[PDB]
């Protein structure tokens, strides 16, 4: 690695993690692997406002409030250190830190919650004191909580001319708090993983088109003298930059040593950009479930007109058409009236709206996309090209997302000069070619991956299918994408993670890859493992959950040897409501599943209750792996049943190896302890070269580099006497 930064040309801190090659590297040239969790989804919503509670949901946000203090970690009751000790004891060295635009700018435009950013600083310092590397996640889901997920403050909806209280009657967004109606909600009946379909309902279809391309498809949406595009992007970027600046000015010791970089905006929605025909839902749209209006059908509903729409079920091979369904808004419109914009919109939050921004009527009709009098669609391919140049067919990633990233990454570097750009292309899209003028040899691909079949069906199936192959039309038929049996399924999923690596080197360059999100649902089979069904039979049996996560985790091993962050870790998770967000339940830990310095955790002299009590399928997500390596990682293999761990390293004659520069491997007590009834490893170790040493949950491996060329060394570990109970 170089002696100066490829971004600034200055010398680097000793803690610097290089991100200019296919692997993270410390200053001694050791390849680093960073593995951990997202902390935390609990930060998606304010205190006492879980997704399923409607009381106070709208009122507090209307008053400009947004109390996220002590999320994700309560710094007042001493629980924060225990949680971090548990994560560190599981061997994690990485945290994807979750924060929302709402939590920063809920009071109003440019009225930032500086107390909450100080809280974030206070949490990040504990993380630094516990030895975690962190990168920051500006997080959202289907734009905002008020459109069915998480992210942006309520006032952005009014800024877009939308009356939040008409979203349900229009079916422009499905809110857990208001399912099936705002009058008689039954949050527990909220269909599984339906919240994601909000991306293909009118509110998100509109707002995301504004955000990434307002100047192109909505040129008459002027707000404060700017197109809504700049209004929204400036305000989102300014907010995140305001947090980075604060950290830079008030806690600069965090930068690079702990906070190594910033993720791009989370899973950005595409809106209607690229829609080839507003009259149909393309067969390529992979996710359909429940009532699924086409774009024009949703717009007609947005004007209060009843529509008979197709409903979709999710079957073993993906969505398929069920029965048709009639949505009747009974005349209720989605669009804020002029009167309400004065009382609740522009006049309340403090902006001026342009004369040509028609209110109380559909904004796409106002731009000639369809005619309201006849309810007829006029320009079905309007988002397919540029109105100014119909010859150019749009690519959302290249033409709109990339331009946003350019402005976003610039701000990040402005306040965090040595920041790694963790590049998150839109879900299941390849990243764009980005200019080295902006990457500057300090970037990492941060794609997400989920076992999609397992996540939608909340079941570990005896079959599975190659999602990425289907998207890339690899197979003549979707049936040829199916695999049967653990082996084939695991090999298939490992091959899917390999595509993420291929995307990086082919497109971005010789940079590392890190799976920013990966995980499996624990609320499987109607919560049999929580004891909810079959007269309580199966309570505590996480066999299916353990196999699903073991398969996802194994996919990051093999030849991939990937960095990743598991989704997720929710201190306030419970069996009844899961993660308290849209019925998702992906937490590794729950108080409902229960029956201290850093130095003591490094010592291994802690109680086994810390690493097991409250965990779910801990055998799958707490695994051996090499934190730092002299050379390049070539292959990781770990087997729960036998506890057998095998790691191959490609060592090169030019690599640096000596007494203080060695390979370090985490060996979890969970799999290798003598007993879990001090704690100690009870293992047999076989190394092709060099010597080894054991203390706590840490294995140190000294070996010499080859005299010339490169050779592959191996180390094998296995618990004495089989696996634990």
Ligand X SMILES: CN1C[C@H](NC(=O)Cc2ccc3c(c2)NC(=O)CO3)C[C@H]1CO
Query: What is each CA distance from 5 to 14, 34, 252, 467, 490, in whole angstroms?
Result: 12, 20, 17, 39, 39
305 as an active site residue: the answer is: no
Tell me what percent of the chain is helix, strand and coil, each rounded to the nearest 5. 35, 20, 45
The DSSP string of 187-241 is GGG--TT-GGGGGGSHHHHHHHHHHHHHHHH-TT-EETTEEHHHHHHHHHHHHHH
Catalytic residue among 102, 242, 270, 517: 517
Separation between Cα atoms, residue 229 and residue 218, nearest integer Å: 9
DSSP bridge partners of 319: 314
Note the Cα 55 to chain centre separation in Å: 28
Select 145 or 413, whichever has its Cβ closest to ligand X.
145
Contact pattern from residue 454 through residue 473 relative to ligand X, giving x for each residue in contact according to CB under 6 A and a dash for the rest: -------------x------
**Which region among 406-414, 444-452, 644-652, 691-699 touches ligand X (by CB under 6 A)?**
444-452
Task: For the beta carbon of residue 243, count every other beta carbon within 10 angstroms.
Answer: 23
Residues 24-43 that bind Mg ion (CB under 5 A): none
**Which region among 202-210, 245-253, 442-450, 500-508 touches ligand X (by CB under 6 A)?**
442-450
- Size of the chain in residues: 725
Q: Which two tokens stand for residue 333?
A: 């419109």
Instruction: Report in angstroms how near the CB of residue 224 gets to Mg ion at its nearest.
Output: 9
**Which region among 12-20, 449-457, 595-603, 663-671 touches ligand X (by CB under 6 A)?**
449-457
Taken in order 576, 580, 583, 586, the sign of the CA dihedral is: negative
Select 330 or 473, whichever has its Cβ closest to ligand X.
473
Instruction: Report in angstroms how near the CB of residue 133 gets to ligand X at its nearest.
Output: 21
Helix (H) or strand (E) holding 98: strand 94-100
Pick from 350, 387, 485, 721: which binds Mg ion (CB under 5 A)?
A: 350
The interface partner of residue 350, options being Mg ion, ligand X, none and the CB cut-off 5 to 8 Å by kind, is Mg ion
Instruction: Report in angstroms how near the CB of residue 392 gets to ligand X at its nearest.
Output: 29
Interaction of residue 450 with ligand X, rule CB under 6 A: yes
Q: Which two tokens stand for residue 667?
A: 């060996």
The DSSP string of 293-349 is --HHHHHHHHTT--EEEEEEEEETTEEEEEEEEEE--TT--SBPPHHHHHHTSHHHH
3-state secondary structure of 418: coil
Instruction: Report in angstroms how near the CB of residue 524 gets to ligand X at its nearest.
Output: 14
Instruction: Report in angstroms how near the CB of residue 447 gets to ligand X at its nearest.
Output: 8
Interaction of residue 452 with ligand X, rule CB under 6 A: yes
Instruction: Report in angstroms how near the CB of residue 61 gets to ligand X at its nearest.
Output: 20
Catalytic residue among 267, 305, 418, 584: 267
Q: What are phi and psi of 610, to 5 degrees?
A: -60, -40
267 as an active site residue: the answer is: yes
Using omega within 30 degrees of 0 as the cis cutoff, is the peptide bond preceding 568 cis?
yes
**Which region among 417-425, 443-451, 661-669, 695-703 touches ligand X (by CB under 6 A)?**
443-451
Pick from 113, 242, 523, 584: which binds ligand X (CB under 6 A)?
A: 584
Interaction of residue 448 with ligand X, rule CB under 6 A: yes
The interface partner of residue 161, options being ligand X, Mg ion, none and the CB cut-off 5 to 8 Å by kind, is none
Q: How many residues bind ligand X (CB under 6 A)?
A: 13
Select 175 or 251, whichever has its Cβ closest to ligand X.
175
Contact pattern from residue 35 through residue 74 relative to ligand X, giving x for each residue in contact according to CB under 6 A and a dash for the rest: ------x---------------------------------
Closest residue to ligand X, judged by C-beta, is 452
Sequence-distant (≥ 6) Cβ neighbours of residue 564 within 8 angstroms = 35, 514, 515, 516, 518, 556
Pick from 427, 481, 529, 681: which binds ligand X (CB under 6 A)?
A: 427
Select 467 or 556, whichever has its Cβ closest to ligand X.
467
The interface partner of residue 561, options being ligand X, Mg ion, none and the CB cut-off 5 to 8 Å by kind, is none
Residues 259-278 that bind ligand X (CB under 6 A): 267
Instruction: Report in angstroms how near the CB of residue 159 gets to Mg ion at its nearest.
Output: 11
The interface partner of residue 614, options being ligand X, Mg ion, none and the CB cut-off 5 to 8 Å by kind, is none
Interaction of residue 345 with Mg ion, rule CB under 5 A: no
Separation between Cα atoms, residue 193 and residue 321, nearest integer Å: 17
Contacts 24+ apart (CB under 8 A), 592-598: 592/530, 593/540, 596/81, 596/82, 596/85, 598/85, 598/88, 598/129, 598/130, 598/131
**Which region among 17-25, 306-314, 448-456, 589-597 touches ligand X (by CB under 6 A)?**
448-456
Interaction of residue 109 with Mg ion, rule CB under 5 A: yes
Query: What is each CA distance from 109 to 231, 243, 249, 642, in whole angstroms?
Result: 10, 15, 22, 57
- Residue of 467, 173, 164, 183 whose CA lies nearest to 291: 173
β pairing state of 420-423 and 259-263: parallel
Residues 77-96 that bind ligand X (CB under 6 A): none
β pairing state of 35-39 and 94-100: parallel
Query: What is each CA distance from 492 to 448, 528, 554, 682, in whole angstroms?
Result: 17, 27, 11, 33
Select 448 or 719, whichever has its Cβ closest to ligand X.
448
- Residues lying near Mg ion in the complex (CB under 5 A) are found at 109, 350
Residues marked as catalytic: 267, 517
Q: Which stretches of the chain bind ligand X, using CB under 6 A?
A: 41, 196, 267, 427-428, 448-450, 452, 467, 567, 584, 586
């Amino acid at each position: 690695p170089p002696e100066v930064s490829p971004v600034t040309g200055n010398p680097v801190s000793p803690h610097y993690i290089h991100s200019s090659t296919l692997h993270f590297q410390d200053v001694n040239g050791r390849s680093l692997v960073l593995r951990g969790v997202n902390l935390s989804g609990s930060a998606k919503h304010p205190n006492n406002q879980p997704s399923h509670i409607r009381e106070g949901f709208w009122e507090t946000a209307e008053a400009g409030k947004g109390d996220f203090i002590n999320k994700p970690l309560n710094l007042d009751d001493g629980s924060a250190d225990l949680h971090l000790a548990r994560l560190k004891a599981w061997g994690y060295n990485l945290l994807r830190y979750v924060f929302t635009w709402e939590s920063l700018e809920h009071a109003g435009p440019k009225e930032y919650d500086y107390a909450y950013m100080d809280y974030i600083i206070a949490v990040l310092r504990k993380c630094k004191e516990w030895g975690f590397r962190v990168f920051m996640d500006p997080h959202q889901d289907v734009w905002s909580r008020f459109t069915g997920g998480s992210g942006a403050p309520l006032w952005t909806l009014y800024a877009c001319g939308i009356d939040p209280y008409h979203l349900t009657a229009t079916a422009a967004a499905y809110l857990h708090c208001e399912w099936p109606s705002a009058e008689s909600p039954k949050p527990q009946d909220f269909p599984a993983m339906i919240w994601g379909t909000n991306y293909t309902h009118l509110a998100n279809q509109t707002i995301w088109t504004f955000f990434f391309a307002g100047k192109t498809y909505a040129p008459k949406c002027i707000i404060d003298g700017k197109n809504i595009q700049d209004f929204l992007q400036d305000h989102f970027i300014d907010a995140v930059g305001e947090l980075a600046k604060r950290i830079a000015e008030e806690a600069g010791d965090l930068l690079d040593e702990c906070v190594i970089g910033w993720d791009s905006i989370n899973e950005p929605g595409e809106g209607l950009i690229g829609c080839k025909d507003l009259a149909v839902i393309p067969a390529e749209q992979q996710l359909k479930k429940g009532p699924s209006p086409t774009p024009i059908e949703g717009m007609r509903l947005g004007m209060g007109e009843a529509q008979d729409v197709q409903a979709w079920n999710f079957g073993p091979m993906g969505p398929y058409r069920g029965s048709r369904q009639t949505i009747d808004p009974k005349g209720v419109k989605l669009w804020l009236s002029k009167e309400d914009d004065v009382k609740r919109g522009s006049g309340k939050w403090g902006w001026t709206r342009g004369k040509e921004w028609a209110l109380g009527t559909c904004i796409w009709a106002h731009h000639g996309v369809w005619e309201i009098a006849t309810s007829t669609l006029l320009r079905p391919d309007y988002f397919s090209t540029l109105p100014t140049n119909p010859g150019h067919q749009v690519d959302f990633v290249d033409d709109f997302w990339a331009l946003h990233w350019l402005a976003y990454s610039s701000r990040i570097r402005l306040h965090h000069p040595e920041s790694i750009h963790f590049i998150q292309a839109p879900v299941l899209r390849q990243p764009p070619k980005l200019p080295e003028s902006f990457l500057k040899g300090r970037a990492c691909s941060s794609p997400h991956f989920y076992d999609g079949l397992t996540l939608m069906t909340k079941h570990w199936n005896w079959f599975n299918a190659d999602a990425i192959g289907v998207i890339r039309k690899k197979y003549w038929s979707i049936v040829q994408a199916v695999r049967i049996g653990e082996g084939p399924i695991r090999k298939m999923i490992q091959g899917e993670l390999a595509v993420l690596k291929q995307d990086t080197i082919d497109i971005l360059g010789n940079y590392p890859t890190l799976v920013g999100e990966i995980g499996i649902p624990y609320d499987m089979d109607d919560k049999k493992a929580y004891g909810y069904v079959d007269g309580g039979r199966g309570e505590g049996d996480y066999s299916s959950q353990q196999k699903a996560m073991d398969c996802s985790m194994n996919a990051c091993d093999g030849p991939n040897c990937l960095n990743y962050a598991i989704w997720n870790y929710v201190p306030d998770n419970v069996h009844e409501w899961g993660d308290n967000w849209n019925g998702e339940d992906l937490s590794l830990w729950s108080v409902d599943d229960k029956e201290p310095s850093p130095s003591v955790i490094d010592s291994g002299d802690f109680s086994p209750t810390l690493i097991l009590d409250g965990s779910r399928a801990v055998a799958a997500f707490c695994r051996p792996y090499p934190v730092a390596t002299v050379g390049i990682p070539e292959r990781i293999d770990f087997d729960i049943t036998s506890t057998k761990f095998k790691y191959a390293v490609r060592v090169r004659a030019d690599d640096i190896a000596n007494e203080q520069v060695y390979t370090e491997i985490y060996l979890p007590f969970v799999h290798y302890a003598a007993s879990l009834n001090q704690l100690s490893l009870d293992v047999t170790i076989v190394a092709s070269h060099g010597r080894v040493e054991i203390q706590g949950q840490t294995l140190r491996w000294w070996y010499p580099v080859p005299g010339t060329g490169e050779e592959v060394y191996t180390i094998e570990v296995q618990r004495n006497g089989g696996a634990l109970r």
